[PDB]
Amino acid sequence: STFGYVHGVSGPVVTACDMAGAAMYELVRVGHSELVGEIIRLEGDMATIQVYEETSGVSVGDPVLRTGKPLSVELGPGIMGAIFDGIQRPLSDISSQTQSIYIPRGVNVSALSRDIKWEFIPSKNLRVGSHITGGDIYGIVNENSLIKHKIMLPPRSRGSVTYIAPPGNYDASDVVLELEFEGVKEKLSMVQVWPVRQVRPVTEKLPANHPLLTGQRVLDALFPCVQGGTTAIPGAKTVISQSLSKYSNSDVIIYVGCGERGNEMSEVLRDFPELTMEVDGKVESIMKRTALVANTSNMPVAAREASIYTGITLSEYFRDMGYHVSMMADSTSRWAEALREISGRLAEMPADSGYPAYLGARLASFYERAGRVKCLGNPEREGSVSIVGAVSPPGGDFSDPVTSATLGIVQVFWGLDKKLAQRKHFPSVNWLISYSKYMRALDEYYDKHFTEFVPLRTKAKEILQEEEDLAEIVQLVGKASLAETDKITLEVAKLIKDDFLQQNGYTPYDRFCPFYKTVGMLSNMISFYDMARRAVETTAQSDNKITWSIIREHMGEILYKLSSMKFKDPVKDGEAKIKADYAQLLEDMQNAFRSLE
Amino acid sequence: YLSQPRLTYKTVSGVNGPLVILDHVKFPRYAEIVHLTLPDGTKRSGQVLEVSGSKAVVQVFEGTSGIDAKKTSCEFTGDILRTPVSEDMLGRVFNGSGKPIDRGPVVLAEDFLDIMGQPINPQCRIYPEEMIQTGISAIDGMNSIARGQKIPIFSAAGLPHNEIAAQICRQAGLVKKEENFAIVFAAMGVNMETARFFKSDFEENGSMDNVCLFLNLANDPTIERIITPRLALTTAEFLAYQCEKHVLVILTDMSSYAEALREVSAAREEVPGRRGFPGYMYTDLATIYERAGRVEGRNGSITQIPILTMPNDDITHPIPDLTGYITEGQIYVDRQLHNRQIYPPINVLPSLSRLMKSAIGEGMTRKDHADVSNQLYACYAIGKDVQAMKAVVGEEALTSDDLLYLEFLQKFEKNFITQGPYENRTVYETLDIGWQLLRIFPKEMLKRIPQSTLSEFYPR
């Protein structure tokens, strides 16, 4: 039958009966108000339905209308700048149609507007009788000045073209394409529907090999992400989100508030339309190339899960267009707590700290959807999705099961540390706990464009590790054992920690730092370490020693210049000027050392 | 209007602790309310937590003692726990169930509201911005509170968190350059001393005409306290979003609330989350804490300051843990300050406020405020580290700078943190003492403050 009846309820879990033919993960409407729910068990003609909306008021014997599709998203024009509920309902259009501050329980606003006119240009290669396959780009929609929305044939669809719309304005209901296979005609509009838990397939999961500049010098030097880079960060988030949203190389951005604090959700939603970037020699709002999935912590447990799978599925859509999507998620821990609550209500056996054992498999089915891809279909193009999933632990402890499962999966991990955050060191990344498995691949790009950088990256982490050794012993011995080279190591480690790794996320001089500035800063600080270390060691067993203090006194101007490198404005001082100034610092540095040699 | 006549059932198949289980029930609703006439002739209310065909599981609000499996008559309303609400609930005192406990009559409704509220669309939220001077230097300076924020006062067990919340209720107002919060106070499971303390404070301060008190005490039935914070928030939604009031909600102990979630969930035979609390406690607490903040087209707003006593003082305990993930940080009231007689015992280091970065700024407050708070906070953190070394390696081993951070901590807990319960320092007045503390160090030590701000404010 087309509808069953509610047999029982327990919070956001509803048992139905007379559901005989229903599939697991099939969508359902429950109650006379049509609350959205999804099947999560079957037992004879009974089914258990997870509900995405508050179930208070649902009665035994209420209708249980099943829909023969799993949890799915509308993909098509009108995603850029939109904001969505975790089951894909537009929070802008719910406001606009409801005329009230509340989301109506059971509201059914179409995920992409049926009313807004779109400029569609059919792809000029096509003709009636042309063969097409999933991921073919049969038209461009001018959704924005920034993002050309490539309309794509759905995956699991293929055939011969029987109708193509001429260039013009069309609605999301207009059948802009018709195709045929096996004598079956199929009709397609500018929108496609895709299951959120099913991966969008690809021609080839290519290796990730080009950096993705976060703008934080510590990250982009010592722990870099890559296009397609599967990444995590301890939630502490806003600056990384905003910096990537303004300046990431990624044409498209997605945010996923999975269980976000209602006020921090409003901060993001209010600030993002007002944030702008200078691109193509013009200034534009990041919202013209972003979308957000928003679920405040009080949204029902299932909406917290659906927010992740919708967010990644949107990312995989813009990936298939050939855009290098970057996605952020507010907290994988809140998602895991949603899985914990679902698991508990469903009477499953949890395994550690009350989490389900399948938590690792859930997280993997998110994080492994990242990466560079060769897209499906005929125009050969490469897209990517980068995932920056945040992971706040109960006391900052990285042994917490969400962090442990994440750490077995992610290739990059930016371990933020309470001691740094407390002393207001920003961006608070611990440079001895964090790692990036992408270095192996990225060293090809670095050796093509930045040949000095790999030596500098290695010497930097070495200097910073020798800082921990020297800093620990000073607690007991004070200065008395330290060699003059150990002093030079501590001085340069202080420069690298306080004037390179440190960066103010709110001040325009440090809001974002380009790579040419980043490598030039580090080049100068480590060239100082090498020249100072030489100046000391050249006098080993000699009649007179060039000490750390003799260096520090003669080099005082150069030391002040070195610390000052961070102040160069990337807007008014272009890369040519910054590189030229830093080349003068290198010459000044060499000549200042030459006075002692 | 629900003109259809109510059904009444004697079909009580069992009574497991706080739960009464009925059978043969015609079309029960999840979260429906029922009224049990007991054999002694008394009424008790309850809410249906589970339904399965003809079975319904009723949680009983006024407790189950005296219920009988044959004689008890259970009346079903056909509806969820829609409470009456009106502006007349100000200047009154209610029990935990929402019935009046002062001399006055039942609430004459301006409307009936679902105590679960309704999800406020994130698009229509207005971000909280205007800083409220609590009057307490730790909460106004090292942390901050904004109108529409939800910042809880966490505490160690037995510490003066009630006095801190009463001081906030006396002193809270906007920064100077109709301004009065209607306070809604929700006591869950409090002792009589705490109840009398707040009830008398609201009367003694003369503000009683503009506050609403829900009292559930430690001698009242456990289950009522599940409803008490929701009633308070429903009143706060009405007053703030329908009647434009600026509202401040105080919830007196979310741990005593969470203990009622545990009692009912154990009786339901449910899968336990960690420490025996319900796995859904994150969602449940979110339906309490997320009712805060400004909204589109309203002038009104709801601030919250929940209170939360940590069991065994454990910062990782599920109640404070799940709370810190939901609330806009926390203010932490610490044994180590209280044993040293420092009132209020607010430890600045573990306290955090998510709004600090945006509530504080030029023209919103004194421009130096954000930088001064950042430097003082880091100085206190370094102060605690050298204070550990002072014992572990002996005081004589400390450097001149370490001894300055130790002197800084000794002066800071005295002059900055200690207030006294009726001192009401302005935010500007707080910042003066802030600089007098920073002046302990040489200018070059103040690494988190810009040189322009130091040259304008350090030589004072």
Binding site: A347, M349, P350 | E269, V271, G276
Partner: peptide
């Protein structure tokens, strides 16, 4: 371990009762 053994026992009893109610 103890809490989870009791949960599993309650499920075992509910499985058995659900089968017995079909006889």
């Amino acid at each position: 371990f103890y809490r989870l053994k009791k949960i599993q026992e309650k499920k075992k009893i509910i499985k058995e009762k659900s089968e017995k109610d079909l006889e």
